[PDB]
């Protein structure tokens, strides 16, 4: 509930609750898209489907799927980056552009 | 929802078990539909090389026919033959589902007066016709490949959904009923103790008061 007071400049980067809205935005409609493909084959549909389809797969792969290394905040927003990488600015419609032209790399 | 009592259990576990056979009855139901997929597709195949082949002889014998002849005398000529028309598509009526089945109506042997000063322009054309043959063979073993294809999809989707729906649907019900079921159990067996307690503190208490 409270994670809108841990998150914040000056106490961890300046857009951490934006970038967790887009994860978690990104992300729910990938296993909604996923839960959509359970029922109908896979080609009647369109291409940001399938490229959520693709930030899924390598969500789930690399983002939760760390096996015990001891990633930092700052490699796993770095990793957060990495994993956004993968979609046009005009479909990350939640977060501020400053943060989309200092990272997005 | 369902107020549960002991009938309703025993309803939900019959629904229950109703659904487990049904899966297994689709499950068969899409093993025979495979079987009879794989029997059409070599079928359809066949068909298609035949047509390929007598495609070869009907494209040599038209290049041929136009090659030694000039363009413009087939040209007329074709512009001249009859449109072929009443072509139509009749009853497959099969897993109660019509498919079209076609078969034309073929004005042929009335030539076009058979006294036809080009030598190339018949055989072309029966070739054509026979091309024509094996083209709505082709036809009607491809639809109906599509439609038990996609009867296949269908049964296929309905397993997976009706088993990862309402078999643990019906199984969350169950699990509330016998929760709840229980609860009502277990407070009549408290009610039981109470009023044994109420039995031997009236014998007990009035002993020594009496």
Redesign the interface.
């Given at each position: 509930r409270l994670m809108n007071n841990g998150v914040g400049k000056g106490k961890t980067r300046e857009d951490h609750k934006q970038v967790s809205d887009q994860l978690y935005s990104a992300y729910a409609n990938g296993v909604d898209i996923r839960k959509l493909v359970?029922?109908?084959?896979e080609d009647a549909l369109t291409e940001n489907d399938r490229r959520y389809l693709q930030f899924a797969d390598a969500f789930e792969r690399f983002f939760i799927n760390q096996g015990q290394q001891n990633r930092s905040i700052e490699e796993s927003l770095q990793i957060a980056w990495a994993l956004l990488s993968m979609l046009p600015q005009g479909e990350l419609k939640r977060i501020s552009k400053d943060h989309i032209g200092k990272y997005y790399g | 929802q369902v107020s549960p009592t002991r009938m309703n259990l025993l309803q939900r576990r019959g629904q229950l078990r109703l659904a487990q056979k049904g899966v297994d009855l689709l499950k068969k139901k899409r093993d025979a539909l495979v079987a009879e997929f794989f029997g059409l597709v070599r079928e359809a195949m066949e068909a298609r090389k035949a047509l390929d082949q007598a495609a070869k002889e009907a494209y040599a014998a038209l290049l041929l026919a136009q090659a030694f002849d000039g363009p413009e005398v087939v040209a007329g000529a074709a512009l001249g033959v009859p449109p072929l028309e009443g072509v139509e598509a009749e009853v497959e009526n099969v897993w109660g589902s019509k498919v079209p089945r076609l078969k034309a109506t073929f004005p042929d042997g009335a030539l076009l007066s058979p006294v036809g000063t080009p030598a190339y322009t018949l055989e072309a054309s029966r070739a054509f016709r026979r091309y024509a043959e094996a083209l709505i063979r082709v036809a009607n073993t491809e639809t109906r490949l599509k439609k038990i294809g996609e009867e296949i999809?269908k049964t296929t989707?309905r397993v997976?959904?009706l088993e990862q729906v309402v078999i643990p649907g019906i199984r969350a019900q169950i699990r509330f009923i016998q929760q709840v079921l229980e609860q009502r159990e277990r407070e009549d067996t408290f009610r039981l103790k109470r009023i044994k307690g109420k039995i031997e503190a009236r014998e007990a208490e009035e002993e020594g008061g009496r």
């Amino acid at each position: 509930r409270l994670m809108n007071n841990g998150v914040g400049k000056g106490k961890t980067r300046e857009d951490h609750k934006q970038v967790s809205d887009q994860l978690y935005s990104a992300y729910a409609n990938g296993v909604d898209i996923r839960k959509l493909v359970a029922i109908i084959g896979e080609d009647a549909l369109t291409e940001n489907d399938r490229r959520y389809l693709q930030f899924a797969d390598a969500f789930e792969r690399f983002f939760i799927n760390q096996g015990q290394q001891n990633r930092s905040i700052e490699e796993s927003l770095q990793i957060a980056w990495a994993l956004l990488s993968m979609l046009p600015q005009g479909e990350l419609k939640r977060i501020s552009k400053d943060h989309i032209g200092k990272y997005y790399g | 929802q369902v107020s549960p009592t002991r009938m309703n259990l025993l309803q939900r576990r019959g629904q229950l078990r109703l659904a487990q056979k049904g899966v297994d009855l689709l499950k068969k139901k899409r093993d025979a539909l495979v079987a009879e997929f794989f029997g059409l597709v070599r079928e359809a195949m066949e068909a298609r090389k035949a047509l390929d082949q007598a495609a070869k002889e009907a494209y040599a014998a038209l290049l041929l026919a136009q090659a030694f002849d000039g363009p413009e005398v087939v040209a007329g000529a074709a512009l001249g033959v009859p449109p072929l028309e009443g072509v139509e598509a009749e009853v497959e009526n099969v897993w109660g589902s019509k498919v079209p089945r076609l078969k034309a109506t073929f004005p042929d042997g009335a030539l076009l007066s058979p006294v036809g000063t080009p030598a190339y322009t018949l055989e072309a054309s029966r070739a054509f016709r026979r091309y024509a043959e094996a083209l709505i063979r082709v036809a009607n073993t491809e639809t109906r490949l599509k439609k038990i294809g996609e009867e296949i999809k269908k049964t296929t989707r309905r397993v997976n959904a009706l088993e990862q729906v309402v078999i643990p649907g019906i199984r969350a019900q169950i699990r509330f009923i016998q929760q709840v079921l229980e609860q009502r159990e277990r407070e009549d067996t408290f009610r039981l103790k109470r009023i044994k307690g109420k039995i031997e503190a009236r014998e007990a208490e009035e002993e020594g008061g009496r």
